[PDB]
Amino acid sequence: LATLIAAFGSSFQYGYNVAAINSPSEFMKDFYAYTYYDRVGEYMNEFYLTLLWSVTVSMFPFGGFLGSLMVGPLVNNLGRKGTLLFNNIFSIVPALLMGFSELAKSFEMIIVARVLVGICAGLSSNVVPMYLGELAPKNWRGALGVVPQLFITIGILVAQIFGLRSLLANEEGWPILLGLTGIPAVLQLLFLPFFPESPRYLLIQKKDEAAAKSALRRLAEIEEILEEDRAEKAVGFISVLKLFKMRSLRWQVISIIVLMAGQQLSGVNAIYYYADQIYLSAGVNEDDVQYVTAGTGAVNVLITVCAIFVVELMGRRFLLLLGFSVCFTACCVLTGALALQDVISWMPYVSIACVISYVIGHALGPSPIPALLVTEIFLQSSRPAAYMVAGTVHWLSNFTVGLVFPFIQVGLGAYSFVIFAVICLLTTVYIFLIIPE
């Protein structure tokens, strides 16, 4: 039960690394600045420290983009569980890199570690539902729709409570907080080895029938069912180019690009990355920020443990529309209470509610649904190529929002969220006019 739950818990390690850089950030930037003139001797420019931190944060979703490309040759060779072991021992390297980063320097042990810890996440985000998908029985499969998403939300919360001002978030304790991401990796390297392998991979790729049957009975019925990896071999798979070329799939491709971009450019990760800096940016006391972000993640989990049943029962289109609308109206009123701060103390309580109300709205339609629709609206042939398009749009949008947002709230100030409302509005219009159930 516990190890069964901790088997797919690689999603937790993703959720951890997303918010893991929010809390220590204040104490971390100092580490950059004084390390700089402890070598060079001159102070680092105010902008370049902001440019360098934007890199630290945005290397993670960039690494995921690279790492998500490798999932194809890896699982076609190493296997599902095999690849899952590969990145785990490979996840220890960036983990201890940040943990011992206290010793030498940030320039490598952090930034180069962030891209390396991103490769693991972008890689597992495919393999994990892939490994769990082939193991699951025929009829009962899709119960995993919001299930790993729940673990991502917990990872965010854990990083926030461990990133509390009191516990690991401080000058001396932050490397322990960063390096703590390797603990569930070394924890998974224990329980997973005696977990069953992939039956579909062993029979088809490895051509071993005895290896497929033995792991099947743990759970020639399913054995002959795997002949659908033969029938599908003749059907072939559409390329990424032919996706755009096909007039049949155009309003599909256009939609997932809009959904994946809209989801990420909505500024959802702009929060979990920058939440500490976001709350400070309006009404919140320097002490209160570390406490309120921890609550924002708690709310996020409560909505996610809800939306698992809500997503399938309430429909695909409505929840999607309702979400981007809430995320739109929460941006206006926020940009908003940020704009005029003279009404304090009346304003800041509103701003905090706006961030919470945004999280709630995004955690229903915008976050879970787009990934689901790609599996549905695309045929088996175009499904592998469709995934890559959606994936590339997701990570690179995630990349840019993590990149530009410090410069946005620096440049646009209290208007920082105006660009997100424009996105939410444009997305809500598209998913209204075009996308049906």
Nearest Cα residue to 80 out of 185, 182, 206: 206
Give the Cα-Cα-Cα angle 371, 375, 381 (nearest 5 degrees).
140
Residue 34 annotated as binding? no
Residue 272 annotated as binding? yes
Nearest Cα residue to 22 out of 282, 284, 270, 263: 270
DSSP-assigned letter for residue 171: T
Q: Contact 71/126 with Cβ under 8 angstroms?
A: yes
Helices (H), 70-109: 71-75, 80-90, 92-99, 106-109
| CA distance linking residue 428 with residue 142, whole number of Å | 27
Nearest Cα residue to 15 out of 297, 227, 318: 297
Single-letter amino acid, residue 75: V
- Cβ atoms within 10 A of the Cβ of 71, count? 20
Q: Contact 135/78 with Cβ under 8 angstroms?
A: no
Residue 188 annotated as binding? no
Residue 277 annotated as binding? no
> What is the token pair recorded at 217?
């009975």
Q: Contact 63/179 with Cβ under 8 angstroms?
A: no
> Which string of DSSP letters, residue by residue, matches 104-150?
S-HHHHTHHHHHHHHHHHHHHHHHHHHHHHHHS-SSS-GGGSSHHHH
Look-up: residue for tokens 């009829």?
Answer: 139
| CA distance linking residue 189 with residue 313, whole number of Å | 36
Residue 14 annotated as binding? yes
Q: Contact 289/279 with Cβ under 8 angstroms?
A: yes
Nearest Cα residue to 149 out of 269, 265, 305: 305
Please count the helices (runs of H) and the strands (runs of E) in the chain. 25, 0
Residue 273 annotated as binding? yes
- Cβ atoms within 10 A of the Cβ of 148, count? 21
Residue 32 annotated as binding? no
- Cβ atoms within 10 A of the Cβ of 317, count? 16
Task: Taking the CA atoms of 99, 103, 106 and 108 in sequence, report the sign of the dihedral they define.
Answer: negative
- Residue 265, phi then psi, degrees to nearest 5: -80, 0
Q: What are the binding residues for D-fructose?
A: 14, 149, 263, 271-273, 362, 394-395
Q: What are the binding residues?
A: 14, 149, 263, 271-273, 362, 394-395
